Each structure stands twice: as structure tokens, then as C-alpha cells.
Design a binder for this molecule. Structure first.
Ligand SMILES: CCCOc1ccc(C(=O)CN2CCN(C)CC2)cc1-c1nc(C(C)C)c(Br)c(=O)[nH]1
Ligand SMILES: [Mg+2]
Ligand SMILES: [Zn+2]
Length: 296
């Protein structure tokens, strides 16, 4: 059943980015099979020039995508492969349609796409604590990175084998920071600086410190990007979140609070960095109006 999936995936035609709607901010996966999401993932790698620039063999990338998909848990309502897949599509869309791609290096883009796909690996649900104890420091995100690394090191799955050891180490580090950044605690701590810098037109991507901060903010933006979706889609994703959160009348005001506290300023900030990411902010504002109206 596994080689069959690999055989079938490796033998399929990969449709264009246009055919697959993968450049749209309003993209939805509900109508896609797992196979189809795997094909969209290949297309994302190829059209970001990653397959070319890093000499990835087709069967290795296919196997890697399948390993990643398999290491999410289907029984988890929201934090599963479709969430990761959606997070990466949003990354792809921000890079392409959002014109973020030109601001970054090839290695940065490679790391971000891998991070996006890998950032919740082996997640067991927000209400699960499976522990050995010992608090935070982003323990879950460290686990996700560890799972990402293990897959990258797996026989037949080494899509980074084409990089030199120096490139490899640099990219692993970007991937690690990128995944660690999806800890909402780290986002809240590092937020203010990002907003402060933009507030004064002080923001500059050339400074390595600010580049790294931006990559962190970008990860969170894609991670949360379901609340930017067209209303019929957001309503449905919110169903999944609600299901995992309690594995419904207070939900509208929760969503408004979430949007106000965490989402709005982020998407406003992103749109400042790049005008073309505006549809994310527009979508987020549109969902605030819908949720608020429900809250009465
Ligand atoms: C849909 C069912 C209810 O979901 C939520 C409920 C509450 C929250 C909050 O963050 C609420 N608190 C309340 C206190 N406040 C300062 C704002 C933050 C987020 C969510 C939420 N989290 C997420 C992600 C972080 C998983 C998404 Br995506 C989402 O659409 N909603
Ligand atoms: Mg996470
Ligand atoms: Zn996530």
C-alpha cells in the first residue's frame, strides 16, 4: 500500500501551479485527495526553483512528502497533515503572489517551505500532554523539529543531500528557528520589536537580526492563515479547531478576541513589508466582521 502510493505519486503528471490554484490566498483543500495534496506539494517545490537549484531527485522528494504526510495524525481534528499542507500553500502564495520571494535567499525559501510542512509533525492535539514532565522552552516545537530532522535523515528521503555541508547547516538552522517560531509564546515575545521597527520605518531586511525576526513572523502568519480564508472556508476550519479544542455559542467572541489579540496586527505588519500580502489582512478583517455579527 505504501510503495503503491509512492509508485502512483512518482508516476503522476504534476499539474501547473495555475491548474492547482496554489497561488491563490483563498485556496482550500477540502475537495482534494491526499494524492492531490502531494502533487500540489511537488508543484510548490518545483515552482520555487527548489528541485532545480538543489538537484532533488523526483523519487526522493516524493518519498519525503509521503513520509511527512504519514507522520501527522489523522485522528487529530485540526493539527494534522491538511493544516501543514495549508500552512505551506500559504507560504507559497505569500512568496509568489505576495512577492516575498524576491526579498529572500534560495536557502531561506527552501528552509521555510520545509518548516511550514514540518512544523506540527506528530502533533497529538492541543489537549494532549504525552510527557516526562518539565514545562516549556517550546517543548512541542522542539519535538516537531526533531521529527522533521529524522525524516530529513531517513534513507531515501534526503532532499537536502544536494547541499554542501555549509549550506546544509545553514538551512537546518533556519528550519529549526522557523519551526521554533510557531510557538505562539515566542511570537508574542518577539512581536513588539517587529511592530516597533515598522512603526518607525526602521525595519530593514538586510540586517541579519531583522531577517530572522521576519522569517519568524512570516511563519506565524502562514500558521494562522485559516482565519484569513473566505467566510465559508473559515467557518469550516473553525469547526475543526473547535472540535480539537473540546475533543458553540462562546465561539464567535473567542474568534473576535483571537483576531484582535493575535492576528490583525500581524497581517497589517506583513502588508507593510509587502503590499501584495494585503489579501491576507483583507480576509482576516472580513472574518472579524462575520464573527462579531454572530457574537450577538
Ligand atoms: C474556533 C474555535 C475557537 O478557537 C479559538 C478560541 C480562542 C482563541 C484565543 O486565542 C483566545 N484568547 C483569549 C484571551 N485574549 C487575550 C485573546 C486570546 C483562539 C482560537 C483559535 N486558535 C487558532 C490557532 C491558534 C490554532 C485558530 Br486557526 C482559530 O481559528 N482560533
Ligand atoms: Mg504548533
Ligand atoms: Zn500549526
Amino acid at each position: 500500500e505504501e510503495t503503491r502510493e509512492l509508485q502512483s505519486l512518482a508516476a503522476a503528471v504534476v499539474p501547473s501551479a495555475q491548474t492547482l490554484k496554489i497561488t491563490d490566498f483563498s485556496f482550500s483543500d477540502f475537495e482534494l485527495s491526499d494524492l492531490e495534496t502531494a502533487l500540489c506539494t511537488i508543484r510548490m517545490f518545483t515552482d520555487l526553483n527548489l528541485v532545480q537549484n538543489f538537484q532533488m531527485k523526483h523519487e526522493v522528494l516524493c518519498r519525503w512528502i509521503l513520509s511527512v504526510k504519514k507522520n501527522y495524525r489523522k485522528n487529530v481534528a485540526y493539527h494534522n497533515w491538511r493544516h501543514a499542507f495549508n500552512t505551506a500553500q500559504c507560504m507559497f502564495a505569500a512568496l509568489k503572489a505576495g512577492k516575498i520571494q524576491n526579498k529572500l535567499t534560495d536557502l531561506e525559501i527552501l528552509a521555510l517551505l520545509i518548516a511550514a510542512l514540518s512544523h506540527d509533525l506528530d502533533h497529538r492535539g492541543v489537549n494532549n500532554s504525552y510527557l516526562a514532565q518539565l514545562y516549556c522552552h517550546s517543548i512541542m516545537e522542539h519535538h516537531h523539529f526533531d521529527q522533521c530532522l529524522m525524516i530529513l535523515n531517513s534513507p531515501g528521503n534526503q532532499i537536502l543531500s544536494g547541499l554542501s555541508i555549509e549550506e546544509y547547516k545553514t538551512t537546518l538552522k533556519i528550519i529549526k528557528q522557523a519551526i521554533l517560531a510557531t510557538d505562539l509564546a515566542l511570537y508574542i515575545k518577539r512581536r513588539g520589536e517587529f511592530f516597533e521597527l515598522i512603526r518607525k520605518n526602521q525595519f530593514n531586511l538586510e540586517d541579519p537580526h531583522q531577517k530572522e525576526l521576519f522569517l519568524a513572523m512570516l511563519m506565524t502568519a502562514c500558521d494562522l492563515s485559516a482565519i484569513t480564508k473566505p467566510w465559508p472556508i473559515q467557518q469550516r476550519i473553525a469547526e475543526l479547531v473547535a472540535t480539537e479544542f473540546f475533543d458553540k455559542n462562546k465561539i464567535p467572541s473567542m474568534q473576535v478576541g483571537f483576531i484582535d489579540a493575535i492576528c490583525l496586527q500581524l497581517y497589517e505588519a506583513l502588508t507593510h513589508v509587502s503590499e501584495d500580502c494585503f489579501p491576507l489582512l483583507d480576509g482576516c478583517r472580513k472574518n472579524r466582521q462575520k464573527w462579531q455579527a454572530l457574537a450577538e
